[PDB]
Amino acid sequence: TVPQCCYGFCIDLLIKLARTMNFTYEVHLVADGKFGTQERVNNSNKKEWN
Amino acid sequence: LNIAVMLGHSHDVTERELRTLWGPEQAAGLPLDVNVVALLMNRTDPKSLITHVCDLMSGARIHGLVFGDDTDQEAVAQMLDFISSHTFVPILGIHGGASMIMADKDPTSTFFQFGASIQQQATVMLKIMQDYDWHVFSLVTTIFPGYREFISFVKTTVDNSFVGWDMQNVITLDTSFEDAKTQVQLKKIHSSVILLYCSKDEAVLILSEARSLGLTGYDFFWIVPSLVSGNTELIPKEFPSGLISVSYDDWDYSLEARVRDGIGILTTAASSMLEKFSYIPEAKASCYGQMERPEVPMHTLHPFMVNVTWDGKDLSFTEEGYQVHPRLVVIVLNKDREWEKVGKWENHTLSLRHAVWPRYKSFSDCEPDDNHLSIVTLEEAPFVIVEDIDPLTETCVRNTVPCRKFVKINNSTNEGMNVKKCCKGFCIDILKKLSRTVKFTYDLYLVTNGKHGKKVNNVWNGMIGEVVY
Amino acid sequence: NVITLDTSFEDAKTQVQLKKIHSSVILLYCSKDEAVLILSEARSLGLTGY
Amino acid sequence: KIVNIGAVLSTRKHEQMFREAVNQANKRHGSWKIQLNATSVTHKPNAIQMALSVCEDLISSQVYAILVSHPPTPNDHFTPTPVSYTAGFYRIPVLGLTTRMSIYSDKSIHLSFLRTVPPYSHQSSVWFEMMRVYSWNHIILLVSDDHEGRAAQKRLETLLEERESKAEKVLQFDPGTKNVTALLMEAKELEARVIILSASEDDAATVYRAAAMLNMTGSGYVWLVGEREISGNALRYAPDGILGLQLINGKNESAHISDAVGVVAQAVHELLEKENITDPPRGCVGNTNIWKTGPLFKRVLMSSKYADGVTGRVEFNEDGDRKFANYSIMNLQNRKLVQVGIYNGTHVIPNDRKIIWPGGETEKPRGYQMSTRLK
Ligand SMILES: *[C@@H]1O[C@H](CO)[C@@H](O)[C@H](O)[C@H]1NC(C)=O
Ligand SMILES: *[C@@H]1O[C@H](CO)[C@@H](O)[C@H](O)[C@H]1NC(C)=O
Ligand SMILES: *[C@@H]1O[C@H](CO)[C@@H](O)[C@H](O)[C@H]1NC(C)=O
Ligand SMILES: *[C@@H]1O[C@H](CO)[C@@H](O)[C@H](O)[C@H]1NC(C)=O
Ligand SMILES: *[C@@H]1O[C@H](CO)[C@@H](O)[C@H](O)[C@H]1NC(C)=O
Ligand SMILES: *[C@@H]1O[C@H](CO)[C@@H](O)[C@H](O)[C@H]1NC(C)=O
Ligand SMILES: *[C@@H]1O[C@H](CO)[C@@H](O)[C@H](O)[C@H]1NC(C)=O
Ligand SMILES: *[C@@H]1O[C@H](CO)[C@@H](O)[C@H](O)[C@H]1NC(C)=O
Structure with a gap:
């Protein structure tokens, strides 16, 4: 979990929101790099989001 | 080392005693061979049970007792739970009053019955309805202890599934x-399949009200749990035919088989205890009473019975004291008011069916019906394409209808199993539109006798021949 | 029908x-004496809705 | 119409005073008919001896109800399980004195068990009323792994789900564990700052010690503690600002037993007009039968309302326990117990005395602390 430096489009909106209202935000990156939907694992009778 | 078993006037005593003695002597050689002390008392009384406990503890420190019964009384198990907890003697549940597991045993008790929990019945019913593709749900319940948690469990199980069942209140x-x-x-009563979680006494009046409203039709279905249908010989005249019930009876496992399984489990537990510890369990100095402080210096058999393997089958138990692989046979009311097996459940917690769809007929009232219209369809035409069921915990896609095909076992053994498949195509869409317009249920059949057919020897073959016949 | x-x-x-009684608007061609019992049965079934 | 009723009582003086109480209850307003005898027994520790004595005395004396009192030793549990099990063979109703265990509330395990005291699960209504009057929305629940705790949390969830409100977190404890630092830190790392405690006395004491160690007794926190979790070492180890619940008329053996015997006498007098009465056998050996009048007794007990007695009214719920009990608000001020309200029927009945809060605050705090920390 090395420190990266992400910037782009949504960062401006996030900064605007933090300026309008008091926010202390920390960004994170998903390990699998997927949006996340319903998946099937062992004991397939389970509906969990990844 | 010392095992005791009691039965009430079941059969001849000496032959059963000899068989029980021979039981552990056929195999499973262990340094401390277990003995059998079999007694036949027809009386089930509290102080009689206390005297039996005193006799067994004075009888070479009987390590465990197997309790058998003939009557159907739930209070016997409740009374015996306290005795088992106080005497520090494990007791197994066999057919009889203690066969059903309803009350929750104390954590310090050593009671483990052969019965089945309600949750297992719920998932068995869910599997049966999934096989029947009965997505319509209707739960009729009455205020009884433990029903609210059962409803919560069934709803948190159905909503978790990907099938997408109905969410009727x-x-x-x-x-x-x-x-x-x-x-x-x-x-609020407007559905096709109704689940009834009630008692036997009120089941008669519930079914009478249903008959008055007219719920005994061919399209309507009823599912009754094991507690209501406790006795298969007492069949009231108000029970409609085609009712689906799940229970367990001696039709597939006799008393001899059950006691064999019990003694095998006890021997495996004793062997595990001897492998782990090197102490012989001993009973209390007094069979009953509270004169000294309650202490259990020796560890119980709860962790030893987690892993049990006997005769190639893992007859283990869970933390709550439920069988991992119970029997859970399915019984459907016969036309002449009998019960017959239509599938088992011991096959690695799977569902088995005898492929018998039409078994429902109105008996409370007289009303003929012919909505079940069979339809025969081919496979070679591009307008109808068949697909195998995907082994991904789901039957098939939602945009199709079930269909059945006969597949011969070999090139000479003519025997076709009713494999469940889903047929999709343009003709399937036409059939769906016709069903939604005329409002009548339509079945599906697949051609297996060659091509369409032609007039040969003044005999029609194929789909045309089936239509003519 | x-x-x-x-x-x-x-x-x-x-x-x-x-x-057979499954509709919204019901036409009743009956008599005054039996109208009371017909409406009592309707109330028992619950035909007095909005 | 001559019957005998057996009783299980603590000491000889209590036995004779209850005998004279039931005699005068026979001689009071309910009279001018065939009377009934009186039988009493002690809570003898020997289980087999007490069971055989109960059989020989009560069962041979045509008993229709069982009078079971609280054990003479509060330290020892002495749960009235064997008596209920014996009475369940013939569906014989019993009348517990002060058994508040939630296991007896369930009718599946105990087919015939009646009592005039609500269990700990009935405190869910009081907690819900407190939340409604104090406008609490974000709460957490601390329940130990036990049947009573599971019943209480299920009751709380069922009572709270009607308003579409859900607790942020529900933690679990164990009967014997002493390390709850991780669970306490998890509870602290939450928006809610109100704690509801329902567990054994030792577990409550150790979790309160851990909370005091981690500075959880400061300002901005509200503690809700059950009835049995405030006594014992809790009073010594708990400073001021801790709320609690106390039951009015919770421990009055004479009054409760008098009310119970009056209720059962009126019920049996009303039911004696029935066509048939089931007679128990002279001994509990060799007889295996069920009473046709068992369900009749249960129905007549459920459907009977008693507005006359020591309490304002006596009625039974679906579980058969007492309904609409007297709940008194209990507060700890200067290491002393202070009552700041009585809830006769779970209504808004406050008092003029000011309610103190942990950390010396004199005003009601709020559980909304977003902290502007959004990952
Ligand atoms: C919250 O935002 C307001 C914006 O006017 C600012 O004045 C205030 O200091 C902020 N509070 C905190 C704790 O950051
Ligand atoms: C105990 O259970 C484990 C669980 O996998 C199993 O591997 C092991 O063989 C069992 N041992 C005995 C003696 O049953
Ligand atoms: C098709 O016709 C041939 C005649 O050439 C006949 O031998 C065969 O059995 C027929 N097949 C079917 C399936 O009818
Ligand atoms: C009532 O109880 C028994 C009869 O069952 C008897 O021994 C006792 O003397 C009776 N008491 C009176 C006052 O008659
Ligand atoms: C409790 O467990 C934690 C583990 O996070 C440990 O750091 C702490 O020392 C333990 N406390 C005691 C008293 O054992
Ligand atoms: C509690 O407060 C004291 C002083 O008030 C402080 O020394 C201690 O570190 C605090 N503990 C925690 C866990 O915040
Ligand atoms: C309980 O109340 C009754 C009547 O209200 C009274 O006679 C009895 O003494 C009280 N109990 C105690 C322990 O004071
Ligand atoms: C209970 O207290 C309320 C006050 O909120 C009162 O209106 C009601 O009459 C009381 N009921 C009884 C039975 O005392």
Whole structure:
């Protein structure tokens, strides 16, 4: 979990929101790099989001 | 080392005693061979049980007792739970009053019955309905202890599934003997398949009200749990035919088989204890009474019985004391008011069916019906394409209808199993439109006798021949 | 189809023919004397809704 | 119409005073008919001896109800399980004195068990009323792994789900564990700052010690503690600002037993007009039968309301326990117990005395602390 430096489009909106209202935000990156939907694992009778 | 078993006037005593003695002597050689002390008492009384406990503890420190019974009384198991907890003697549940597991045993008790929990019945019913593709749900319940948690479990199980069952609200009766409020709540009763979680006494009046409203039709279905259908010999005239019930009976496992399984489990537990510890369990100095402090210096058998393997089958138990692989046979009411097996459940917690669809007929009233119209369809035409069921915990896609095909086992053994498949195509869409317009259920059949057919020897073959016949 | 009552004072056949009673607007061609019992049965079934 | 009723009582003086109480209850307003005898027994520790004595005395004396009192030793549990099990063979109703265990509330395990005291699960209504009057929305629940705790949390969830409100977190404890630092830190790392405690006395004491160690007794926190979790070492180890619940008329053996015997006498007098009465056998050996009048007794007990007695009214719920009990608000001020309200029927009945809060605050705090920390 090395420190990266992400910037782009949504960062401006996030900064605007933090300026309008008091926010202390920390960004994170998903390990699998997927949006996340319903998946099937062992004991397939389970509906969990990844 | 010392095992005791009791039965009430079941059969001849000496032959059963000899068989039980021979039981552990056929195999499973262990340094401390277990003995059998079999006694036949027809009386089930508290102080009689206390005297039996005193006799067994004075009888070479009987390590465990197997309790058998003939009557159907749930209070016997409740009374015996306290005795088992106090005497520090494990007791197994066999057919009889203690066969059913309803009360929750104390954590310090050593009671483990052969019965099945309600949750297992719920998932068995869910599997049966999934096989029947009965997505319509209707839960009619009455105020009884433990039903609210069962409803919570069944809803948190159904909503977790990917099938997408109906989410009809539970139609809970306010109280028994309602001559007016039942008609008020009758508005919410609008479905096809109704699940009934009630008692045997009120089941008669519930079914009478259903008959008055007319729920005994071919399209309507009823599922009754094991507690209501406790006795298969007492069949009231108000029970409609085609009812689906799940229970367990001696039709597939006799008393000899059950006691064999019990003694095998006891021997495996004793062997595990001897492998782990090097102490012989001993009973209390006094069989009953509270004169000294309650202490259990020796570890119990709860962790030893987690892993049990006997005769190639893992007859293990869970933390709550439930069988991992119970019997859970399925019984459907016969035309002449009998019960027959239509599938088992011991096959690695899977579902088995004998492929018998039409078994429902109205008997409370007389009303013929012919909505079940069979339809025969081919496979070679591009307008209808068949697909195998995907082994991904789901039957098939939602945009199709079930169909059946006969597949011969070999090139000479003519025997076709009714494999369940889903047929999709343009003709399937036409059939769906016709079903939604005319409002009649339509079945599906697949051609297996060659091509369409032609007039040969003044005999029609194929689909045309089936239509003519 | 017309839901024609067989005869008056039916404590069981009315519940049998109740299956055909599934609609919103009901036309009642009956008499005043039997109208009371018809409306009582409707109230029992719950036909007094908005 | 001559019957005998057996009783299980603590000491000889209590036995004779209850005998004279039931005699005068026979001689009071309910009279002018065939009377009934009186039988009493002690809570003898020997289980087999007490069971055989109960059989020989009560069962041979045509008993229709069982009078079971609280054990003479509060320290020892002495749960009235064997008596209920014996009475369940013939569906014989019993009348517990002060058994508040939630296991007896369930009718599946104990087919015939009646009592005039609500269990700990009935405190869910009081907690819900407190939340409604104090406008609490974000709460957490601390329940130990036990049947009573599971019943209480299920009751709380069922009572709270009607308003579409859900607790942020529900933690679990164990009967014997002493390390709850991780669970306490998890509870602290939450928006809610109100704690509801329902567990054994030792577990409550150790979790309160851990909370005091981690500075959880400061300002901005509200503690809700059950009835049995405030006594014992809790009073010594708990400073001021801790709320609690106390039951009015919770421990009055004479009054409760008098009310119970009056209720059962009126019920049996009303039911004696029935066509048939089931007679128990002279001994509990060799007889295996069920009473046709068992369900009749249960129905007549459920459907009977008693507005006359020591309490304002006596009625039974679906579980058969007492309904609409008297709940008194209990507060700890200067290491002393202070009552700041009585809830006769779970209504808004406050008092003029000011309610103190942990950390010396004199005003009601709020559980909304977003902290502007959004990952
Ligand atoms: C919250 O935002 C307001 C914006 O006017 C600012 O004045 C205030 O100091 C902020 N509070 C905190 C704790 O950051
Ligand atoms: C105990 O259970 C484990 C669980 O996998 C199993 O591997 C092991 O063989 C069992 N041992 C005995 C003696 O049953
Ligand atoms: C098709 O016709 C041939 C005649 O050439 C006949 O031998 C065969 O059995 C027929 N097949 C079917 C399936 O009818
Ligand atoms: C009532 O109880 C028994 C009869 O069952 C008897 O021994 C006792 O003397 C009776 N008491 C009176 C006052 O008659
Ligand atoms: C409790 O467990 C934690 C583990 O996070 C440990 O750091 C702490 O020392 C333990 N406390 C005691 C008293 O054992
Ligand atoms: C609690 O407060 C004291 C002083 O008030 C402080 O020394 C201690 O570190 C605090 N503990 C925690 C866990 O915040
Ligand atoms: C309980 O109340 C009754 C009547 O209200 C009274 O006679 C009895 O003494 C009280 N109990 C105690 C322990 O004071
Ligand atoms: C209970 O207290 C309320 C006050 O909120 C009162 O209105 C009601 O009459 C009381 N009921 C009884 C039975 O004392």
